[PDB]
Structures are given as C-alpha cells and as structure tokens.
PDB file of C-alpha atoms (C1' of nucleotides) in Angstrom:
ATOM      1  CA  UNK A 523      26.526  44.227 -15.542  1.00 32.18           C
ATOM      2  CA  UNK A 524      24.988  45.645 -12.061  1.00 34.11           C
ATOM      3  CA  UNK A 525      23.063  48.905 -13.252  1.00 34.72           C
ATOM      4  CA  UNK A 526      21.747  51.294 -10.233  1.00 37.41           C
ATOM      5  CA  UNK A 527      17.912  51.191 -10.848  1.00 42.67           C
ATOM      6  CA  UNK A 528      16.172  53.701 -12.487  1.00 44.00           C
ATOM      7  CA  UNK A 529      12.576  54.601 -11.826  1.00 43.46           C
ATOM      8  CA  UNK A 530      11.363  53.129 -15.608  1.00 44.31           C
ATOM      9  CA  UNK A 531       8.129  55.607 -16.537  1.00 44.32           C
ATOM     10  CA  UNK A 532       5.265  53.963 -18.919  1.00 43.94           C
ATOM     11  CA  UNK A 533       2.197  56.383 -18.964  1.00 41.04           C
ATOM     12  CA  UNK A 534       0.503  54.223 -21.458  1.00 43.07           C
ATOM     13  CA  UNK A 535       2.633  51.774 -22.640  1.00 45.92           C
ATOM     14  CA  UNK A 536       3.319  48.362 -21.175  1.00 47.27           C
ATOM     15  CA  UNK A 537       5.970  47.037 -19.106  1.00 43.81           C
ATOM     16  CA  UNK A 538       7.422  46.110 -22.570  1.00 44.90           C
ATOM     17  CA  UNK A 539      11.013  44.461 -23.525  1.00 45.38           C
ATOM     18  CA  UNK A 540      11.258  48.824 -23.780  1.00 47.27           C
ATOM     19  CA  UNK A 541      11.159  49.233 -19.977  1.00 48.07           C
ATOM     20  CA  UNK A 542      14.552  50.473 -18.768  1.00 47.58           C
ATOM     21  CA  UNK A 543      13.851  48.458 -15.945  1.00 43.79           C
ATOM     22  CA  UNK A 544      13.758  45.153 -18.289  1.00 42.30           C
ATOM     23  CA  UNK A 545      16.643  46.685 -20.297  1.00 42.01           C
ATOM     24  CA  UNK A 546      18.645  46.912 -17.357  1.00 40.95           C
ATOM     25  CA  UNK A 547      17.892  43.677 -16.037  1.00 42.06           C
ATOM     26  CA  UNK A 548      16.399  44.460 -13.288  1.00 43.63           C
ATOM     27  CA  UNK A 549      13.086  44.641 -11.458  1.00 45.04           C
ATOM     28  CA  UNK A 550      10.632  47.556 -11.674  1.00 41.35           C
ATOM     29  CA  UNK A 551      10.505  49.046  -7.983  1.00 41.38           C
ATOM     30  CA  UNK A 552       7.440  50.296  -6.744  1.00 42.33           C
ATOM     31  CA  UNK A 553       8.951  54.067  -7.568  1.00 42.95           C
ATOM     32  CA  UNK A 554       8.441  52.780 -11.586  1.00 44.90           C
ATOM     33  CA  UNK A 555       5.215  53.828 -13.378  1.00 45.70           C
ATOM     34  CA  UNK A 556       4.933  50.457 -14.202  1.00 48.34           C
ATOM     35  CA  UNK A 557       1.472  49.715 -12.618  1.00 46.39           C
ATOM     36  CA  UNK A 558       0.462  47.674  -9.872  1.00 47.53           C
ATOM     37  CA  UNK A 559       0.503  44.630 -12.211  1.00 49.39           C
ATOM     38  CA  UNK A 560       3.808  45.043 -13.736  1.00 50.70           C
ATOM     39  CA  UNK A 561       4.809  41.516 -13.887  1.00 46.76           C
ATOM     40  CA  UNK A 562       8.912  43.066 -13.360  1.00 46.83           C
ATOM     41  CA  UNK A 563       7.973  44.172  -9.793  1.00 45.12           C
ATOM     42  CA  UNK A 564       8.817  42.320  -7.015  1.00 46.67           C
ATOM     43  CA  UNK A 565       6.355  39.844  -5.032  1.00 47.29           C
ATOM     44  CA  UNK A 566       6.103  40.091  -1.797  1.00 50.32           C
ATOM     45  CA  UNK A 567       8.880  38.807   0.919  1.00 49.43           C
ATOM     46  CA  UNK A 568       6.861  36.202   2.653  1.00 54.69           C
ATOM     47  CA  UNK A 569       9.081  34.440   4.735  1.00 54.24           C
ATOM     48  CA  UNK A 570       7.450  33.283   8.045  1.00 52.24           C
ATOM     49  CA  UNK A 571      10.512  32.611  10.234  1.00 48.76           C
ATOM     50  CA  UNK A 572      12.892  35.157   9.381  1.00 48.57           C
ATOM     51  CA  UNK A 573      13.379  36.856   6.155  1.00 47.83           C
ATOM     52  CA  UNK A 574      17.234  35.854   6.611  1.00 49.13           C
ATOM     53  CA  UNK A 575      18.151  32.378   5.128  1.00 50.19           C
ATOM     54  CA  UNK A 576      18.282  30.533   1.756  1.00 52.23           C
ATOM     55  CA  UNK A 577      14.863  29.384   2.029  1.00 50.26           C
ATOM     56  CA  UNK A 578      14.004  33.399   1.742  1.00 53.12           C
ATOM     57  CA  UNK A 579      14.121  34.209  -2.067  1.00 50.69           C
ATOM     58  CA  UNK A 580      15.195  37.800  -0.732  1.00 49.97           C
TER      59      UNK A 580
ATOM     60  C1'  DC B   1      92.839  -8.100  -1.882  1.00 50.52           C
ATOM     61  C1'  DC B   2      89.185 -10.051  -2.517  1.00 49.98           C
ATOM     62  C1'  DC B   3      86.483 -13.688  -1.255  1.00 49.75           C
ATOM     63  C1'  DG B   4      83.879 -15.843   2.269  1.00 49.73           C
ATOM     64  C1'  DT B   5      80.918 -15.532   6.327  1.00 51.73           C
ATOM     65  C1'  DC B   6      78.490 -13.029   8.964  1.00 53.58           C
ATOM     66  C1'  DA B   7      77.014  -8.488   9.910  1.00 54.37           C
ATOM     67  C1'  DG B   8      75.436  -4.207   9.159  1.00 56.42           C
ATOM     68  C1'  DA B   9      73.575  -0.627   6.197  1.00 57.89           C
ATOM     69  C1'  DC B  10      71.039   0.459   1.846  1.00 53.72           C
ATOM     70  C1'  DG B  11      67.425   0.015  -1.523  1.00 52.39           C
ATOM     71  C1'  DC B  12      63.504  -1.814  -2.601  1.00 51.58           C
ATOM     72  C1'  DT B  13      59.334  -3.496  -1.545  1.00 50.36           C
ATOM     73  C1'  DG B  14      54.893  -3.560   1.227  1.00 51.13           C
ATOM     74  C1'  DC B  15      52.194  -1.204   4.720  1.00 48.75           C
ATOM     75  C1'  DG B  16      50.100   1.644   7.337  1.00 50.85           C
ATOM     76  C1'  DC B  17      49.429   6.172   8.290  1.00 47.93           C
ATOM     77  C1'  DC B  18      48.186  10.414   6.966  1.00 44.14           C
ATOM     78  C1'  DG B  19      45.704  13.959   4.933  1.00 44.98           C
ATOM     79  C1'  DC B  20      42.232  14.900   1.394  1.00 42.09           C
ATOM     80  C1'  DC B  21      38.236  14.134  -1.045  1.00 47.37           C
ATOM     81  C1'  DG B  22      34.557  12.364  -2.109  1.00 44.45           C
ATOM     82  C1'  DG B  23      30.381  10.295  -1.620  1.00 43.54           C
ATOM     83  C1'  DC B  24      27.119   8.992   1.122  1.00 41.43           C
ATOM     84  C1'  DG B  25      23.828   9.105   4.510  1.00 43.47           C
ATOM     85  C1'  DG B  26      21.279  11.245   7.705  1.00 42.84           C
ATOM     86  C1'  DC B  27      18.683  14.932   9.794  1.00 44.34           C
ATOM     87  C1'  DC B  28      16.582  19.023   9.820  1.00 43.94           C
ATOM     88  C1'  DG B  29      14.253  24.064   8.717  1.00 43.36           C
ATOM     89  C1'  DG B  30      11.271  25.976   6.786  1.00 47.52           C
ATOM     90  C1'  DA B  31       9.246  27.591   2.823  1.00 48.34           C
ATOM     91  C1'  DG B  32       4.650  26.874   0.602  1.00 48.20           C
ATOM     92  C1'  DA B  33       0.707  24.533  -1.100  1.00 48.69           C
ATOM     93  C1'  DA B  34      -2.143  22.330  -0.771  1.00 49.68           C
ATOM     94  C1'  DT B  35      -5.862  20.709   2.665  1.00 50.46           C
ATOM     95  C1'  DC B  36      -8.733  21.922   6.752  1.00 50.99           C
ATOM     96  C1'  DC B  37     -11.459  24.015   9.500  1.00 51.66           C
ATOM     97  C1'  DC B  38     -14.296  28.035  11.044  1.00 50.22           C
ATOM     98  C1'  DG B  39     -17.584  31.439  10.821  1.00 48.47           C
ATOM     99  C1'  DG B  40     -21.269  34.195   8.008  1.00 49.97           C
ATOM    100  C1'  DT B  41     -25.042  33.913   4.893  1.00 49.35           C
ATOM    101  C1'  DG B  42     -29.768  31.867   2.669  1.00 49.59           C
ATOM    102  C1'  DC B  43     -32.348  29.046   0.986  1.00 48.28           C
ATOM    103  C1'  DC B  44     -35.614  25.064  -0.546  1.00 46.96           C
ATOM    104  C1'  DG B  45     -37.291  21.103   0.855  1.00 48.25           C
ATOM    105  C1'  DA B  46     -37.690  18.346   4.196  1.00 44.61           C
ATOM    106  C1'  DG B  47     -41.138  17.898   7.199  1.00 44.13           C
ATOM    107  C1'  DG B  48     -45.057  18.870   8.427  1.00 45.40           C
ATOM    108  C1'  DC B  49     -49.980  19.237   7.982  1.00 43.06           C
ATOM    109  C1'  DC B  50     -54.689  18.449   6.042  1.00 42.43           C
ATOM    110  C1'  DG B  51     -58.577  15.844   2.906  1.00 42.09           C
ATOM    111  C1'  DC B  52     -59.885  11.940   1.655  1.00 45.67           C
ATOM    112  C1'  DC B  53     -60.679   7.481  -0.027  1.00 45.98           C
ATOM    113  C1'  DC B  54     -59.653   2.049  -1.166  1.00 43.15           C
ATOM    114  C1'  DT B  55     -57.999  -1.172   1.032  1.00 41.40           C
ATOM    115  C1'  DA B  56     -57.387  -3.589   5.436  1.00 38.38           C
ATOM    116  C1'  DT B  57     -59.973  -5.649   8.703  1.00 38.40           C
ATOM    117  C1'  DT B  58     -64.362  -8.463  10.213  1.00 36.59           C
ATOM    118  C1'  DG B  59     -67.924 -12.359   9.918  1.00 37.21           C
ATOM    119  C1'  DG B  60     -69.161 -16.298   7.800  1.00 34.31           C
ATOM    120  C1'  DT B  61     -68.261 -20.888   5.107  1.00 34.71           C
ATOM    121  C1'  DC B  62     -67.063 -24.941   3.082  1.00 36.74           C
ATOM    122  C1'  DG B  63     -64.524 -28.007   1.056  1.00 36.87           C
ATOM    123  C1'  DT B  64     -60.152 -29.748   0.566  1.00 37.64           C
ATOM    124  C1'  DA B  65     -55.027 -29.749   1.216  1.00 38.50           C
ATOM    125  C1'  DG B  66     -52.728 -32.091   4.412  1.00 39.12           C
ATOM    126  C1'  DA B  67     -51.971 -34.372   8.381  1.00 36.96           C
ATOM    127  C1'  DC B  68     -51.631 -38.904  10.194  1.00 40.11           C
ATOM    128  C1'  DA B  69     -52.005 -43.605  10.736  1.00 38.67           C
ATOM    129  C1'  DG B  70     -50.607 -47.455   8.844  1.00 39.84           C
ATOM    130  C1'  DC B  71     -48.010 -50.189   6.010  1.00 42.18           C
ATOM    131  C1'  DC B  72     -44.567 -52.943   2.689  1.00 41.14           C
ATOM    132  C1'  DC B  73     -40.026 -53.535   1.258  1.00 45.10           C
ATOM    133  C1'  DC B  74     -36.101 -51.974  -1.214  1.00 43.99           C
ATOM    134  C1'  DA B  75     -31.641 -50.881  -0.686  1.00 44.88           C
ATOM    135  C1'  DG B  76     -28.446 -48.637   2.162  1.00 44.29           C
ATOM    136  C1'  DC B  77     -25.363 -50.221   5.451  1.00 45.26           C
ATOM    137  C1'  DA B  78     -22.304 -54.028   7.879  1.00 41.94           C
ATOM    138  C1'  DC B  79     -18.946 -56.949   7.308  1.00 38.50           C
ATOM    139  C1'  DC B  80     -15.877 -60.313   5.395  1.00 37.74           C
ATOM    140  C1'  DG B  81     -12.262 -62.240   2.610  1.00 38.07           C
ATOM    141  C1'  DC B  82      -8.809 -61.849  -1.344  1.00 36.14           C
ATOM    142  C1'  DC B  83      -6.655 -59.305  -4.573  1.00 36.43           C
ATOM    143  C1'  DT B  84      -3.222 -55.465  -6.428  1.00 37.23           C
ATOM    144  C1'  DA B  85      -2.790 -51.575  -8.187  1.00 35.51           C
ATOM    145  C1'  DA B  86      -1.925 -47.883  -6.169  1.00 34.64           C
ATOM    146  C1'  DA B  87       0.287 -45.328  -2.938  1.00 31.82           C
ATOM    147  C1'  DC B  88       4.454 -44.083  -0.710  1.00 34.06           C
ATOM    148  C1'  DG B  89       9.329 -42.995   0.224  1.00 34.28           C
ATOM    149  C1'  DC B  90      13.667 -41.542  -1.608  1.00 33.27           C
ATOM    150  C1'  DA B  91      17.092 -40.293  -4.949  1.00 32.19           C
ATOM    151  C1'  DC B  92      18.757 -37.244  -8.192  1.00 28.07           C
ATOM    152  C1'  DG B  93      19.528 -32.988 -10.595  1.00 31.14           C
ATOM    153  C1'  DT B  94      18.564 -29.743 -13.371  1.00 27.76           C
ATOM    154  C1'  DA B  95      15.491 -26.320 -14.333  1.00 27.67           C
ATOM    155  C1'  DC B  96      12.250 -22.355 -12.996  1.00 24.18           C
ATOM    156  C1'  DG B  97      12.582 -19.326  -9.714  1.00 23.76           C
ATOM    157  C1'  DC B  98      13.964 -15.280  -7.896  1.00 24.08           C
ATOM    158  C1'  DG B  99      17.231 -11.432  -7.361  1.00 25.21           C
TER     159       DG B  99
END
DNA sequence: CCCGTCAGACGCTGCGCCGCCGGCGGCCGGAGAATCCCGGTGCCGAGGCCGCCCTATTGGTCGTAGACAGCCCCAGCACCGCCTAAACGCACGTACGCG
C-alpha cells in the first residue's frame, strides 16, 4: 500500500496515531506541520562516503 | 537347432564427471559511536611571602657503657668402621586427565 505523501497539518495537535502521515505509513516531510520535533520526519542522510550504498539507510 | 565355446553386444553396476548448491571462509567498506584531542574560558590554591618563636645548636661534665685483654673449655667437627633400611630402578596398567 504505497500512498503519494500528503503534507499532514497539526496546528495544535501532536504528531498523533491521527497524522495522515502515520496513517499512511509514511514519514512526515518537512512540507508537514508536524514541527521540527515530529518524531515521523526523517533524520538526516549522513553518509560520509557516498549517500549511494546499503550502508546508507537512504 | 540348440548347445557349447568363444565372442561380441547389452544391461547392470560403479565411477567419475558435471553442474548446482550450499556452506563456509575470508576480506573488506564504511557506517557510527564511542574515544580523543584541541582550543577557549576562569578560577582557587598553590605558592609565595611575612612575623615570630621554641627548638636546635653550643659549652661543659662526669660517670659509665663498652671496649678490650685475657682466659678456660665445651662441644662442634673429623673420621672411622659396621650395619641396613632405605633408596632406586623397572614393570604394569588402569585411572585421572584432557579434549
């Protein structure tokens, strides 16, 4: 079940089990209101050599 | 004709080859998670300094440990012979041990 992300939008609540994000399995991109400490969002890519092998969680 | 002997082909048996698969082993890349420095910052406490006095040093003594000078004599050391128990060598083997 690959959904196209939506920007999920949560003015006051929390990045709930109610974020469309979360309901749709997927992370909350920076485009979400989810706040900067939305635990859905993605980390960082930190992968020294290249960004390009199975080491690289991207 | 079929049997009999030998011969030749078949079937069966045993083998290796062959391809596949697996497992293994090795080696490595590189994330990443700590540790490791490296530099900036600020104390507080060495360390440093001063006042002072109580103890360390000086002079004298005197009397006694202790040297030392001498000495006797035990007993530690040699050694000597005869003895045998005690030591030694080996002979198994099974049982602790080590994996």
């Amino acid at each position: 079940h690959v959904y196209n992300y939506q920007p999920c939008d949560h003015p006051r609540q929390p990045c709930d089990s109610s974020c469309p994000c979360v309901i749709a399995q997927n992370f909350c991109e920076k485009f979400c209101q989810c706040s900067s400490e939305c635990q859905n969002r993605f980390p960082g890519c930190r992968c020294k050599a290249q960004c390009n092998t199975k080491q690289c969680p991207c």
